[model samples]
Target chain A: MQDLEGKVAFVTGGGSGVALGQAKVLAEEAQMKVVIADIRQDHLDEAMGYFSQKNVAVHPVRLDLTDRAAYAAAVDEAEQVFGPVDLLCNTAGVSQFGPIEKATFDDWDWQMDVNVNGVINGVMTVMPRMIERGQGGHILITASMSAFVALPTTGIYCTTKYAVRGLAESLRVEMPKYNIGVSLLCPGGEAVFAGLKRVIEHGFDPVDLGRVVLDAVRNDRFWVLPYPEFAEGQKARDQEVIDAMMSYADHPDYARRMKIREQMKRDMPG
Target chain B: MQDLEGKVAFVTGGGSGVALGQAKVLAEEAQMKVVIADIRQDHLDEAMGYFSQKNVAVHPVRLDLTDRAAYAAAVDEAEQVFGPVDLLCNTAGVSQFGPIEKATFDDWDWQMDVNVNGVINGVMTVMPRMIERGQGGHILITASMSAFVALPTTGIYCTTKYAVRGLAESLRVEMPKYNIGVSLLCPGGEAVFAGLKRVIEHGFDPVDLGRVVLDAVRNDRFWVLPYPEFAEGQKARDQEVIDAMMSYADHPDYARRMKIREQMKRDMPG
Candidate 1:
């Protein structure tokens, strides 16, 4: 897991944005054999060309994560070009907006299909091979700061990110016994995205995330938070959760459970 | 929003388990017009008899939450008997187990369909009318403690619960402008499912959760942790997150960003 040079890595949604940034870094800088699996053929072609110009060995596979059979087939195609996947980056995501009231079936399906199920498809398809290989691989997923803190008009997006974060946390705990390392790339409030312009003055570069991916894989780290500015928001969210738990002490039944509540307060760390 | 009497309450998966527990409390204790929506007709029938014996006015609607068309129709049918829904409890969920490596597409679809999309369908279909009627309503979702902390062999289940938790948190912050209250019910290790016997003792009663549901609606609280034993585990998880943030200060680029990381640590609250 410490080695990235000449290792075979599969990157989903590698045609643009954050995924592309990671693929470029792994291929050009880290000298890893890469597969750029993207839903759009044009994006895949463009990424393929860019990698070729950079003299990095790369393969492009068109994939739609919602299509189970096609996504499963993508792995074989990746192996046909490179070898067994030594690392996986489940970075494909579709953004969602609007209130819960106005979200249509299409909206829900579009986001969940790609965001939640897409991550599932990638892991399910690639993870078995990685385990069977017994070479000690790594997995990094795009969870976003939304996984820790919620914001308006992005309920569905937050839902998917949180799901990914949970999946990653569980996998990080369980998969290490099989020599697979799991990491979460949570772009905090100061993170940028493709095709989206904001008035916000500060955001972390996608390349910063790309570097973290390599560092996390090499060191077997679980958390890869690119934006330090997110610390305040995450702390606030955790505070809200703690405050709710503290209120339980004020219940009518508190007298009977006062000892336990007091013990919880003692166990809590700053 | 504070009142539950005479309000129409819709509880998905109300045929059995904790969901049925909530429905009974709303109908029998709170005096609310209730719709017990379930995927199984036999379960719905059994619940109907109990409500009848208890002399509670209840409407049974057979609903498969994944079926968008029928689910929308079921809402209208509920209105025929109980009027507009003033409260929604998205409690329908399917359990999943085993390692991620062994998961199949069928397994992923089954869990994601009911656990994630099912919640979305309920909120999307019912939330608009609540907003339009200008009568404030409350939403409570069963996210489980998995939303806060990860456990082994339940990666898929954790993914869905985390997604629901994120959606609820976002809605809680955003929908307040329209007076739509959102709450998350995180059952600690102390929850039991019907038909499954657990060796684990000290499980919370369904009736206990039933009372919390009513209280959450009346108080507009954003969180409902049914068991206080979860506080220690939550505090530990939050501590891990803070430690990760602190590690950034030891990074090679720390000199250039020392002030920012220091500020992050200062802003973080216990």
Candidate 2:
């Protein structure tokens, strides 16, 4: 929270929601040089407008996280402009919800590469230099509550989220002694109109994300968690587990979950 | 639960400990054909006694999980003796634990390949046939409680365990259509003398795991959670997170996770 002013904050998917939201926070409050990365031109134009008007103008670099060359080039350009990206926040990820029962190899591949490997690629690019400089940079990943919870739907998304959490933890272990820091921002809120309603295969609107970033930008916290309930649900889930272990107390919701299991049984198409 | 009797069960890594424990249960009580696959000849010889003495003979195949050929060949050899091999139980996994900062890449690579890719290899071989046969089939992956809760010193091991959980959940989503059941066994206790010590990376065996799995097998409970206490630990960890998120809560432990954070505070060698 203290290292923002004058430091360069480079955010992926920065044209939109949380990435941009984090960027907005970094730029507006910290007065940091912000580089917003994305793939969509229209979104880039929208982002350009936001930054230019704010005087906390952000540099826009359009590239896809899944594209190695493009992603590397984008980082290179940002580094050249912003001086090695003092803070890297991988806040871009997909919101996928569907039953695992219907997942295909293609679906699995895309989801794994983007949601999990995407964060990996970015960290790999920025972490080495941050370690070399010894200036002590930080990495903030926008992971989800689903990273811990075993949600039944959106199997690939959940898997990717879970993988994200693991990756962050692993990286933290490796880089904790150097100038680099890793933080996973578990934020919950419905960002964008109706949560990016299933269009454009993978395309996302930049402005909706910008608005959220604007909110987080207004606040100084790296993990801009807007809603309070997501954190609450996590507590309850943890409690059920504790109850099961400590006293062999049947989790309070164990029966409820089981009943839901039965209802789901009937919900299944016969 | 009722279906295991006389049903053929193929268990890899069955030479000793959890594998052997499971094979014995399936053979003795379930009255099913059991095949024990492992890499060690001595362990196989040992398992031969445990699975079958006369009528319900257990077949042992010595092979590695990383080799694609070995996985397919192992399955072929086992099925050659029994009818069709269903109920794929992937229990073979290796652990390398230390803080990633001090841990070697080789250690991390081996763990991921053996534990994560190992499961992939086994699942690839049998899942299709299980799908084609029209008869019901199930797959159980021996993911540790480490998969769910991030163990402090065991981050590397936790990475693969978590990855395996991701892979398994994805498979469950993809394979549920043909009456194929996929469950991840997040055993909290020891799978054997080694696993318990390795779970904490502390070199001490926790004994409760054997009873947990043995009892589960007797009842046809696929989860086979070995130590209920580990799950309790996970719950407690989750509660910490919850308390940290409350209105008045503050995350004190969050920054302590950084390995470098310690370095920053320590007086240099000079």
TM-score of chain B of each: 0.89, 0.74
- Candidate 1 structure quality by residue, lDDT tens digits, B182-214: 889886541222101121124456777788888
Put down candidate 1 lDDT per residue, A118-230, tens digits, no spaces. 88888888888888888878888887877876666788888889889988987986798888988888764313221111211244556666887888888888887644444
Per-structure clash totals for the candidates: 0, 13
lDDT of 2 by residue, A136-195 (tens): 777777786556555456566766777777777666556556746666666433222122
RMSD of 2: 13.4
Each model's TM-score for chain A is 0.87, 0.74
Q: What is the DockQ of each candidate?
A: 0.42, 0.15
Ten contiguous residues with the weakest lDDT in model 2 chain A: A192-201
Choose the strongest candidate by TM-score.
1
Determine the backbone clash count of candidate 2.
13
